[PDB]
Structure formats: C-alpha cells, structure tokens
Structure 1
Amino acid sequence: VSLLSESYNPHVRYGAAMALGICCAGTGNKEAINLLEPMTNDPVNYVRQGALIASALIMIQQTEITCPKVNQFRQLYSKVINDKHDDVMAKFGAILAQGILDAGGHNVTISLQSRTGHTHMPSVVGVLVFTQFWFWFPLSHFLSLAYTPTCVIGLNKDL
C-alpha cells in the first residue's frame, strides 16, 4: 500500500492510511509509521485526520521507548487542536487520537487476533463500523468493543 498512499486523490490516500492503521495496530512496525509521516503533511484536510487516527492505532500501549515518533506525534495532536487557523475537521481526530492512545487509562488495547488463532468478532465488528464516523456520530461508540484488556491474572481457582 506504500504506492497507493501516494495516489493523486486524497480519498484513496485516506483509505490507504486506514489500512495501515487497522492492520498494523497490533504490531509495532516502524515502516507503517514511516509511510504515515508525510500523510499529515498533505494540504488536503481530512487525509491529515486519517493520519492522526492511524498513527493513534499504531501507538496503543507503546511508549516512547518503543518507537521514537511517539512524543513527535503527541505534540502534533495538541498543536493542531490549539491553532485556530487549522480546519475543525482535522482537529476533531486530534483529540480523538489522544483518546485512542489513552484508552482505558493506557491499560487496554485492541486485538483483532487472539493468541488462540481466531479473530475476535466484537473487536472487528466495532472497528469496521467505526470506519465512517462522519455519517453517524453515535457509530464512534462501537470502537469501545474493540478495546481488550491486557493483564496478568494470577487467580488460582474459584474466588
């Protein structure tokens, strides 16, 4: 998808940022981040928004010690929302992305693939309906099902 992210129309560039967002969210792949760097620099408004949310899914539960671009992005999220000259559209996904990185108090993440080998359907369904949040704003709440707890439970038996 590296070459589709360079397409002339920002609609295919938006879908192309989303592909890397949802597919690579369970991974710490740096190549995906590298291709999502120039996406927030496009003069088109909403494609920058797409880069915000995608880059928010690559950094779930991953701190600065994972990839060096974490703080780089976190200052950009607040920068775009505190500037009046920027589009309201682009600054929507900014605070939304801050919500992605901080989801569950940083304690939870999204996982489409359990370790058992089977896909988690509430996760997948939630995120796929969450693809278009413009058309229906309450559809942004279906992403809450995608959040899965990552914890070590040492319960021996019973209560």
Structure 2
Amino acid sequence: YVRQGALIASALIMIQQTEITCPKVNQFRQLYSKVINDKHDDVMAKFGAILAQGILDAGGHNVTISLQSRTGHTHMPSVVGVLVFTQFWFWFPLSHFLSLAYTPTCIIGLNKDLKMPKVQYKSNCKPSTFAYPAPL
C-alpha cells in the first residue's frame, strides 16, 4: 500500500529531470522494468510500479506536467485528471486519465504567417547537466 503510493508520486517529479541532474532517476528507471520482468513482488505492488514507469518516461522523453497555468489558478485539465487517478484500487481503467495531464513543453515563437517554426530563444543552462532522459 505505501509502496504503490510512493512510487507513483516519484514519477510525477522526474519527468524531464534526468540521470545527470539526480542519481535517483537512474535508480527509479531501472526499478520499473525489473518489476514487470520478475514475479518476486506481490501483484498489488506491481500495479503501482508499472503506472509510474509510463509517467516518468512519457512521450518519448518530450512531455511534462506543468506547475500551474500561464499565470494564476492550477492548470485546468491537469488537476481533475490527477484527482480521479489516485483512486485506481476499485477499478483499474481510472489510470488512463493521466494522458490529459501531459502537455508538450515547447516555448513557441512564430513567423509572420503564424505557423510553427524553429526560432530561437536563449536559455542559460549547461548541456552537461540537462539532457533528455535516457531510455530504460
């Protein structure tokens, strides 16, 4: 019961936080896949371990769940999804709702015909310290 809740919660933080920003990401990633392959654990525990995997890794290492909205009140589709998610014990299909929380993280500047380009913005970080999460 503690294991299932702790492990899901970890997954929510780790999205777009990488192996070269905490060792924790290495430990967590490895642990997910180990559970599915093995039968060592009790089945109750595995349900939590496997959902937590999809969240951490999500979207090909491209998507994040936001803190808030663009200003003010907490992002509107995101909060709901999570509320219903936490209850999954009585009914398994409730876990699906976590797709709604995922929003792609791109800051977008545009051309004067108003369609996606590859324009640049400056961000002060080091490429030795942030990079997209390494797969399982």
| TM-score, scaled to structure 1 | 0.64
Distance change (3 Å), C-alpha of 1:90 and 1:71: same
Which residue, out of 51, 54, 78, partners 1:123? 78
Cα distance in 2 for partners of 1:77, 1:97 equals 8
Q: Per-residue deviation at 1:53?
A: 0.8
Say whether the 8 Å CA contact 1:112–1:123 is kept in structure 2.
Answer: no
Q: Which of these two proteins has the greater Rg computed from alpha carbons?
A: 2
Cα distance in 2 for partners of 1:51, 1:154 equals 38
Q: How does 1:4-23 map to 2 (within 5 A)?
A: none
Unaligned runs of 5+ in 2: 114-135
Q: Per-residue deviation at 1:131?
A: 1.2
Q: Percent identity?
A: 99
Q: Deviations over 1:86-140 (max 9, x none)?
A: 1111112222111001212121111141242232121000111111012222221
Pick 1 or 2: higher relative contact order, CA cutoff 8 A, min separation 6: 2
More helix by share: 1
Cα distance in 1 for partners of 2:29, 2:53 equals 8
Distance change (3 Å), C-alpha of 1:157 and 1:125: farther
| Counterpart secondary structure, 1:129 | helix
Cα distance in 2 for partners of 1:84, 1:141 equals 24
Aligned twin of 1:57:
12
Q: How does 1:30-109 map to 2 (within 5 A)?
A: 46-109=1-64
Q: How does 1:23-34 map to 2 (within 5 A)?
A: none
Say whether the 8 Å CA contact 1:112–1:124 is kept in structure 2.
Answer: no
Unaligned runs of 5+ in 1: 1-45
Q: Per-residue deviation at 1:157?
A: 3.4
Q: Per-residue deviation at 1:82?
A: 2.5
